[PDB]
Amino acid sequence: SGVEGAAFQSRLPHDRMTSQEAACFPDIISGPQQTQKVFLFIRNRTLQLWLDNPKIQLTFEATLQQLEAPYNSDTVLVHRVHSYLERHGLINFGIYKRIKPLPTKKTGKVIIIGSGVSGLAAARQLQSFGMDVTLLEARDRVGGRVATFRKGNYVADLGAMVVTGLGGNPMAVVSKQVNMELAKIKQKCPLYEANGQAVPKEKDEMVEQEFNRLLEATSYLSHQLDFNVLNNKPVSLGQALEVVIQLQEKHVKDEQIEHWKKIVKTQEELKELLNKMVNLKEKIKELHQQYKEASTAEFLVKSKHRDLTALCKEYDELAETQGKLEEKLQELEANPPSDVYLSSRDRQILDWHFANLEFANATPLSTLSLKHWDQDDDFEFTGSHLTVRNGYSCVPVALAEGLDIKLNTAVRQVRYTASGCEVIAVNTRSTSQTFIYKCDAVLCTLPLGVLKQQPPAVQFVPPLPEWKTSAVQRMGFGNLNKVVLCFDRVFWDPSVNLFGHVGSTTASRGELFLFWNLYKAPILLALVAGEAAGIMENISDDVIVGRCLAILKGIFGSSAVPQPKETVVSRWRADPWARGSYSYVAAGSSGNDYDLMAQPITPGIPRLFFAGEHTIRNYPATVHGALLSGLREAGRIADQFLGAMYT
Ligand SMILES: Cc1cc2nc3c(=O)[nH]c(=O)nc-3n(C[C@H](O)[C@H](O)[C@H](O)COP(=O)(O)OP(=O)(O)OC[C@H]3O[C@@H](n4cnc5c(N)ncnc54)[C@H](O)[C@@H]3O)c2cc1C
Ligand SMILES: [Hg+2]
Ligand SMILES: [Hg+2]
Ligand SMILES: [Hg+2]
């Protein structure tokens, strides 16, 4: 119904109790039988109230004076539940019209490094929780990896772009709090070969099926044959993909020989029978004559014929088998089995499919861990993916509308004593060059690519533990850029949301393999994935944009493709503040390292906390994952520097 709906939108079992909820309400409800029944209801009921209007602060009081006959009778458990929820950011999170103003007297000082979605997400929580929160963004703007290009009437989105489902997506709440227009993505997508050729629907279907076919084989080798460690080395997805393919290439060369074989075993039978026949032609030739000339004419001529009968008559089975066989020799030479697994043209189309996976996981397929690159799948939201029409930057800007964000300052050192901790940052685009932030706790929102920067970029007085950094280095941070093309008008099909360009070579199959049309203005978004992404980051926007034009008027109008009025090209590897797209499970790593990343570090009570895209295990590499990780720490921190929820 409706109350049980909210539970789902909150990623919570409706009739069950979270491992967490169990803890905060220790048998106080995990004791009797039908007393928890009530509990859960009071939970879902609130979850519902909040969700039905996340543009306002859902008060304990408001929650109370809105419950049914029983429930609101026991005023105490309600509060218990409400606080619990409000603490974990299941209600009153994001940006809402606050009732009951913040406490002028804040408690504790928290320094949050970076102001990405996880940063802002956390910030606000803590703020609301009644704490002193200051964000140090080293980038003249908020939103980090949610970067939107805004020039005149054009809107682009070089960072996050898609909102993958609204089924249990916290982003569904934020999205309506901010009044951000989302739009569904037309699945239809046509593939144009490296010539413009639209690729016949049937070929596109066979190959794509053979893609899903291959990929699933891969899954079998992994989860059914434990083909995860070959030669004390970790198996990568791409490694396995190449195994399965090579195996189907085997079946082909195989049933190819079973054929050639029996064609020959028959060619030999006719030749072995032709001799038997040519040899019988003599016997029926030597006799046939001694018959006519010796036609002695008593019981003799009566027999030469009895003889010639048998011979001419046995010469029938031969000439009869000959045909039979001689003709079956055609049921073979006339119907060969497939001579090749995939045509050179096929593979290229197949590669596009690979590139499309590389685009998703933001890393060459070779880099992926055969066993865990899927690991998070069990939590994907329900409902179709949407595009933001007015620019994703809405969310972050909106979310920053009330906190003190120390922009343009770059944290280059983090100190943490058993007691307080110091943060030293530098300024860059404003008269300064050295600051020092003293505070109780540090919330690190630094992207995995930065924590990986060799040099490195930021230092941690007591160095980060063994376990930590070793996890940081074995995880994966990928890359993937975009090529924005602002035009004079639409020269492409308006009812199509996306179309692909088949690549030339397996390597560089990700080179501008997918154009994207999602806006009002005449604007296409070109994608560079796979190993092409990093390399391409070394070319002029001009040259890159030129390769786009070709492919374009190559598939469209005979040079009936205008000159882009405007143009942008992203380079996330280079961005010193990002160092790549987002994480991915690399061969050797696993879903555990995401957990170790969340792990707070305590000096020789905890000081250093981490959040961000690379911190959240079942929602990595996403904006909602970042936001959830954000809320998570915000809560965790306030449980130590304030108190823990009871029942
Ligand atoms: C091309 C591309 C496409 C994507 N598409 C999607 C998509 O469709 N959907 C989706 O859900 N996700 C997508 N993502 C990823 C998503 O945007 C990120 O996962 C998310 O923004 C990460 O959140 P974060 O809070 O960790 O912040 P950022 O990743 O926002 O990280 C922290 C912030 O700190 C700043 N900072 C860095 N170094 C320092 C320093 N030394 N001192 C101080 N501040 C510093 C950064 O500039 C940044 O603002 C995409 C990413 C890329 C690159
Ligand atoms: Hg397509
Ligand atoms: Hg197979
Ligand atoms: Hg906005």
User: Is it true that 1-108 and 235-342 share their CATH fold?
Assistant: no
How far is residue 535's CA from residue 511's CA, in Å, rounded to a whole number? 10
How far is residue 264's CA from residue 332's CA, in Å, rounded to a whole number? 10
How far is residue 61's CA from residue 59's CA, in Å, rounded to a whole number? 5
* Integer CA distances (angstroms), 226 to 217, 230, 243, 371, 378, in order: 13, 10, 14, 9, 20
Q: Which residues have C-beta within 8 Å of that of residue 135, sequence separation ≥ 6? A: 112, 113, 114, 115, 119, 120, 123, 403, 404, 405, 406
Regarding the beta carbon of 450 and ligand 1, being less than 6 Å apart is answered: yes
Query: Which atom of ligand 1 lies nearest, measured to the CA of 458?
Result: 41
Beta strands in 478-634 (DSSP E): 481-486, 498-501, 514-516, 523-528, 566-569, 583-584, 608-610
Resolution in A: 2.9
**Is there a contact between 459 and 520 (Cβ–Cβ < 8 Å)?**
no
Domain ranges of the chain: 1-108, 109-234+343-647, 235-342
Site to substitute for ligand 1 among 169, 385, 582, 597, most atoms within 8 A of C-beta: 582
- Pairing status of strand 109-113 against strand 132-136: parallel
Q: What is the DSSP letter of 396?
A: H
How far is residue 547's CA from residue 644's CA, in Å, rounded to a whole number? 58
The encoded tokens of residue 200 equal 């016949």
Considering only the C-alpha atoms of the chain, give the largest distance between any 2 of them, rounded to a whole number of Å.
141
Ligand 3 centroid distance, CA of 215 (Å): 9
The encoded tokens of residue 405 equal 């964000």
CATH code given to domain 1-108: 1.10.10.10
Ligand in nearest proximity to the CA of 143: 1
Ligand 1, atom 37: nearest CA belongs to which residue?
577
Regarding the beta carbon of 446 and ligand 1, being less than 6 Å apart is answered: yes
Q: Which residues have C-beta within 8 Å of that of residue 645, sequence separation ≥ 6? A: 24, 80, 83, 84, 87, 639
Local structure of 416: helix, strand or coil? strand
Q: Which residues have C-beta within 8 Å of that of residue 609, sequence separation ≥ 6? A: 441, 442, 443, 444, 600, 601, 633, 636, 637
Ligand 2 centroid distance, CA of 499 (Å): 5
Regarding the beta carbon of 609 and ligand 1, being less than 6 Å apart is answered: no
- Say whether 162 counts as a known binding-site residue: yes
Ligand 3 centroid distance, CA of 403 (Å): 55
How far is residue 345's CA from residue 352's CA, in Å, rounded to a whole number? 11
How far is residue 446's CA from residue 577's CA, in Å, rounded to a whole number? 9
Ligand 2 centroid distance, CA of 359 (Å): 13
How far is residue 135's CA from residue 143's CA, in Å, rounded to a whole number? 12
Burial 64-77 (b: 16+ CB within 10 A, else e): eeebeeebeeeeeb
Tokens 């996340």 found at: 54
**Is there a contact between 423 and 437 (Cβ–Cβ < 8 Å)?**
yes
CATH T-level assignment (fold) for domain 235-342: Helix Hairpins (1.10.287)
How far is residue 39's CA from residue 315's CA, in Å, rounded to a whole number? 96
* Integer CA distances (angstroms), 253 to 250, 259, 340, in order: 5, 10, 8
DSSP of 74-102, one letter per residue? SHHHHHHHHHHHHHHTSSS-SS-B-SS--
The encoded tokens of residue 489 equal 């008008």
Regarding the beta carbon of 396 and ligand 1, being less than 6 Å apart is answered: no
Ligand 1, atom 2: nearest CA belongs to which residue?
159
* Integer CA distances (angstroms), 31 to 25, 360, 612, in order: 10, 46, 37
Ligand 1, atom 10: nearest CA belongs to which residue?
622
- The one-letter amino acid code at 277 reads M
Q: Which residues have C-beta within 8 Å of that of residue 239, sequence separation ≥ 6? A: 230, 366, 370, 587
- Say whether 137 counts as a known binding-site residue: yes
Experiment type: X-ray
Burial 336-363 (b: 16+ CB within 10 A, else e): eeeeebbeeeebbbbbbbbbbbbbebbb
How far is residue 587's CA from residue 240's CA, in Å, rounded to a whole number? 12
- Say whether 161 counts as a known binding-site residue: yes
Q: Which residues have C-beta within 8 Å of that of residue 396, sequence separation ≥ 6? A: 115, 116, 117, 120, 142, 143, 144, 146
Tokens 């305590």 found at: 602
- Per residue, the 3-state secondary structure of 215-235, as one string, reads HHHHHHHHHCCCCCEECCEEC
* Integer CA distances (angstroms), 398 to 143, 162, 174, 178, 323, in order: 10, 18, 10, 7, 85
**Is there a contact between 157 and 391 (Cβ–Cβ < 8 Å)?**
yes
The encoded tokens of residue 297 equal 């004419």
Ligand 1 centroid distance, CA of 447 (Å): 7
